[PDB]
Design a protein around this ligand. Structure first.
Ligand SMILES: C=C1C[C@H](C[C@H](C)[C@H]2CC[C@H]3/C(=C/C=C4/C[C@@H](O)C[C@H](O)C4=C)CCC[C@]23C)OC1=O
Length: 253
């Protein structure tokens, strides 16, 4: 019964535009990473110790910051995103930033050892490194769970970039002015994704794939909510702002 329409010239161009945007903002080699403040890993195996020193915070905070910059770059390249007001663009970016960081980090995350591998031993990030940055298991364990669930979806790069686009352009963000326009753009992307899936993804990973992708966006809200609680606690630590960046402070604070 179900129709499988072809991708329109506009939909074809949109996937092209997005893929191109991603390749310009995601370094698959991770060759900027050494320019960050060096990672420090102390003896831990204690939340008191974690907050006392916060050895991994300056590095991961630099990574997060770096990523946010790339997300901003990426969002500005989304078809229609430039049509929104500067005020709206900022709101959408700030409230999706952390979600899209988690979302994009999937390219680096490996099921081999349940870590984020960005080359080396220095740039292999485990749960223990994220605790060393002052974040509790209440956020991390379900992040890994989300990361794994997303890996087993086996998304095409075409699907992966369209999802990052849909994440950003969400009309149900707190603070949006022109929610009608944002929804209009999101719809154009959703339909491209729904079309792409139906006529470009082979079974048995094709059936019910869109519904699972929308669900991952709901999990991303939970994590966003959790990150907010944990960043707030983290901020209360004295001389912590210096371990962050002017951009991470503004976007998350
Ligand atoms: C300073 C932090 C750390 C924390 C970030 C959280 C816990 C997660 C989300 C994505 C994770 C990671 C992402 C890894 C990368 C590397 C590469 O894939 C680029 C991508 O943008 C990215 C962030 C690995 C460590 C913990 C991160 C930063 O929030 C903060 O404010």
């Amino acid at each position: 019964d179900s129709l499988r329409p072809k991708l329109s010239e506009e939909q074809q161009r949109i996937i092209a535009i997005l893929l191109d945007a991603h390749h310009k903002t995601y370094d698959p080699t991770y060759s900027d990473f050494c320019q960050f403040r060096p990672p420090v890993r102390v003896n831990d195996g204690s939340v008191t110790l974690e907050l006392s020193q916060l050895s991994m915070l300056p590095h991961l905070a630099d990574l997060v910051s770096y990523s946010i910059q790339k997300v901003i770059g990426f969002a500005k390249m989304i078809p229609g995103f430039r049509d929104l007001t500067s005020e709206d663009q900022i709101v959408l970016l700030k409230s999706s930033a952390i979600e899209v960081i988690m979302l994009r980090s999937n390219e680096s995350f490996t099921m081999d050892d349940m870590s984020w591998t960005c080359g080396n031993q220095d740039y292999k990030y485990r749960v223990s490194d994220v605790t060393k940055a002052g974040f509790s298991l209440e956020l991390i364990e379900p992040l890994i769970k989300f990361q794994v669930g997303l890996k087993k979806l086996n998304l095409h790069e075409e699907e992966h970039v369209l999802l990052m686009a849909i994440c950003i352009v969400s009309p149900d963000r707190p603070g949006v002015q022109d929610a009608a326009l944002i929804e209009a753009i999101q719809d154009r992307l959703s339909n491209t994704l729904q079309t792409y899936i139906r006529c470009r993804h082979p079974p048995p990973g094709s059936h019910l794939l869109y519904a699972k992708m929308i669900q991952k966006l709901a999990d991303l809200r939970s994590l966003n909510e959790e990150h907010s609680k944990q960043y707030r606690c983290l901020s209360f630590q004295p001389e912590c702002s210096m371990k962050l960046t002017p951009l991470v402070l503004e976007v998350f604070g």
